[PDB]
Amino acid sequence: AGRISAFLKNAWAKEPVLVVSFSVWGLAIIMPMISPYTKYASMINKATPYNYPVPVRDDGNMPDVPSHPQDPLGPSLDWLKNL
C-alpha cells in the first residue's frame, strides 16, 4: 500500500497527464456498469419510429394488440417523459 501509493504520488507529481489519461480510461470502462440510466439508451433508440408500423390482420386471437393508437393495450413510453 505504502510503496504503491508513493509510486502514485511520484506519478501525480511527474506526469499528471498520463495519470489523468489512464483514470479517464478507467472511468469510461467502469461507469457504464454502475449507472442505472444505461438501459434507457437502448430503450429509446428502439422506441424511435424511423419506419412505418405495418399493421396486421384482426384474425380474432390477438387481444394484447390495439385497434387504434389511443388504446392502452399496447406499449406506452411515459417513462421517457418521466425521465
Partner 1 sequence: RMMRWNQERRRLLIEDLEARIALMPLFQAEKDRRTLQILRENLEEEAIIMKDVPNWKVGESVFHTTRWVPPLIGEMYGLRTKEEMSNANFGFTWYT
Partner 2 sequence: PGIVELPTLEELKVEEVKVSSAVLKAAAHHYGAQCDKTNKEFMLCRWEEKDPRRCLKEGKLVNGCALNFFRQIKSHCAEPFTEYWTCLDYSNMQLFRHCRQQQAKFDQCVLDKLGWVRPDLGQLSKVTKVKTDRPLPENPYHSRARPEPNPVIEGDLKPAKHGTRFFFWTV
Partner 3 sequence: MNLYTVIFINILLSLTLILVAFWLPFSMKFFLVAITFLLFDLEIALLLPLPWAIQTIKTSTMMIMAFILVTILSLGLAYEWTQKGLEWTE
10: cell is: 511520484
**Alpha carbon 83 to its chain's center:** 12
Judge contact between 32 and 38, C-beta under 8 A: yes
**48 near partner 1, rule: CB under 8 A:** yes
Among 29, 34, 54, 56, binds partner 3 (CB under 8 A): 29
Residue type, 57: R
Q: How near is the Cβ of 50 to partner 1 at its closest, in Å?
A: 7
**17 near partner 3, rule: CB under 8 A:** no
Other C-beta atoms lying within 10 Å of the C-beta of residue 43: 13
Q: Per-residue string for binding with partner 3, 32-71, x by CB under 8 A?
A: x-----x--xx--xx-x-----------------------
